[PDB]
């Protein structure tokens, strides 16, 4: 049978599910289950399935494939020409497993704490939990040396439902105990220009996204709030007045700003969104533009393999070509989760008093 | 408990929802179940539920509220504040379930036409099924004049399947044979600015929109193709050529183009996303600009109900006054469904040739 190429809005969820890491692959050796990875045959954009080697639609999510449906296939579309979309896919689903990991560590340290230490951290201050930085997400491509992009997806069931449950379990602990965590930051840009870079971590080179051209495997990034530990004119009473989240991000129970995490893995900061926005959904600080370019080869490709009447009347005005120039203007709304634009904008604290160094993630009081 | 005020993302949930006649609304007397017509007491904006006595948010989706949540409410939210949404909401509601009825009885009518009437048509052309206007919706607030929107809501499970269902199959059949149907517009925007309105149509006063000034009852709108139907120099060679809805659609199994109705019902066409969409999807051709007037009262209460610095918590900079005249530039994107902008632009036959009238839905040869 002859095929028709997906439309554009089809391809931008694609791109969405990708910075979520939820594509849904079909790969003849694995099926639907991208656990082990392998090259994709087809993958789902928006309510249709298509198939990669030619980029045309073979079915609706609504039917359920289960094989490549056979099809007249030009097999012009080759790995590299959407490879980007499958590695921001795949590195998205591991750093959001890693994510995962760490916040959990933090919560079950949190839930430990003896009620006497609690008690005491909250009159004097004081340390109450610190992870050993080389314990986070330790034989993952953001840790290891000997692993890679395309090692095996640790198997979680209900990974969105885990996130919000432990990040909310975590943040309402801080935020009773007017808490100091050393792993959050009030604009995540800030990560990227702004802070002040101490020790091992002023060598970091950020990409701002998840892609092949440089290293994601980097240390674990943290405030270093050893200063403020010591600052004999900075104690409880200080803290609770203006370092604690609340203070910045509003109390976490009664707010729906957006709290996002230093560089814990990826050289990425996590932003997790509000509990007042009704779930605390966990999304990579990447630009909407920079996530439009893991098409840009895919766009040069269909271009090349498909006539241009057939590119108009799936793409629409300007063809494919069109699509992604009028995407890239649209970006901000279109690529970008409402909570990447929630974050407060009446600051106390902020992000620019102390330095950021590769070291142990700590919650302080 | 403290409640703060919905954000805006939440808000634009609210009205897109409201527009496909899907708002959740708890009220004492009926619970989650909006079957029956009852003063709203709760409404799901988003991830958020809302207290409408006060708009603040008492909870969320996950937490399954079984009841108002006892809170420190303001209480001066009225009805009037946000009945237009209530509105909005149900009109969609018993609009939907009007056009599903109409959609199934022309399948029901198509699966029984005998092999050889069909045969019949094809081959020379003629009326296949004609369903009496009047039978089309007959007790529901835009037919009946005893009826109002207030009445109980049809009850039907699973109707977005069963729109997607009915639309799929009655296009097929109309796809196979090459028939022509007097009921679909290459471009709804043609029936309010664009068509000629034939004998009793030329009464027509189009709203644009499901509002309480609006007068929804109605005959129902179609194409007058009497004048196609006899004259022999546009016979069946001619029709299959030039009229079918292919020729300016692309062949329904094969297209992401959305065709649209007529106004069968309320002066609204409705509009049916493409079958390469991976869904047949039904929406009121409404702008989004209209929709996000529903609000415009609703945002003048919260301006004298909330201080200034709760509504920027919540809202943004500028407050909600500010949210609503953003989203006014940006309601071609958010608060405008795909299918409404992926209709045809190479048009071959058109909207244009023949006059609209009340009277039957028909298909043809
Ligand atoms: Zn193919
Ligand atoms: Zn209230």
């Given at each position: ?132 930085w ?48 050393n792993f ?36 674990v990034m943290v405030y270093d ?37 230093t560089p814990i ?91 950021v160094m590769i070291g142990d993630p700590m919650?302080?009081?």
């Open positions: 049978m002859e095929v028709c190429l997906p439309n554009g809005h089809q391809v931008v969820d694609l791109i969405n599910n990708a910075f979520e890491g939820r594509v849904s692959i079909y790969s003849a050796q694995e099926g639907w289950d991208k656990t082990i990875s392998a090259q994709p045959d087809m993958m789902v954009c928006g309510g249709a399935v298509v198939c990669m080697h030619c980029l045309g639609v073979v079915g609706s999510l609504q039917r359920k494939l289960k094989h490549l449906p056979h099809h007249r296939c030009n097999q012009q579309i080759r790995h590299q020409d959407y490879v980007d979309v499958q590695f921001a896919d795949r590195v998205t689903a591991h750093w959001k497993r890693g994510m995962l990991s760490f916040v959990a560590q933090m919560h079950e340290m949190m839930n430990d704490v003896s009620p006497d230490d609690l008690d005491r951290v909250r009159t004097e201050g004081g340390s109450l939990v610190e992870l050993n080389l314990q986070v997400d330790p034989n993952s491509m953001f840790r290891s040396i000997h692993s890679s992009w395309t090692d095996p997806l640790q198997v979680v069931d209900d990974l969105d439902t885990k996130l919000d449950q432990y990040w909310t379990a975590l943040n309402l602990m801080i935020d009773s105990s007017d808490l100091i965590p959050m930051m009030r604009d995540p840009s800030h990560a990227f220009n702004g802070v002040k870079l101490g020790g091992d971590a002023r060598q970091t080179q950020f990409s701002r996204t998840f892609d092949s051209r440089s290293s994601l495997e980097w240390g709030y050893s200063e403020l530990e010591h600052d004999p004119s900075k104690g409880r009473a200080y803290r609770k007045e203006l370092v604690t989240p609340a203070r910045d991000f509003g109390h976490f129970g009664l707010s729906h700003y957006s709290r996002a995490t893995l990826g050289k990425m900061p996590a932003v997790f969104s509000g509990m007042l926005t009704g779930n605390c959904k966990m999304y990579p600080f990447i630009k909407g533009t920079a996530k439009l370019k893991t098409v840009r080869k895919l766009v040069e490709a269909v271009n090349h393999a498909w006539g241009v009447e057939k590119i108009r009347y799936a793409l629409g005005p300007g063809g494919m070509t069109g699509w992604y120039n009028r995407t890239m203007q649209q970006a901000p709304i279109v690529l970008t989760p409402a909570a990447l634009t929630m974050f407060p904008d009446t600051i106390k604290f902020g992000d620019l008093n102390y330095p919650i302080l009081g």
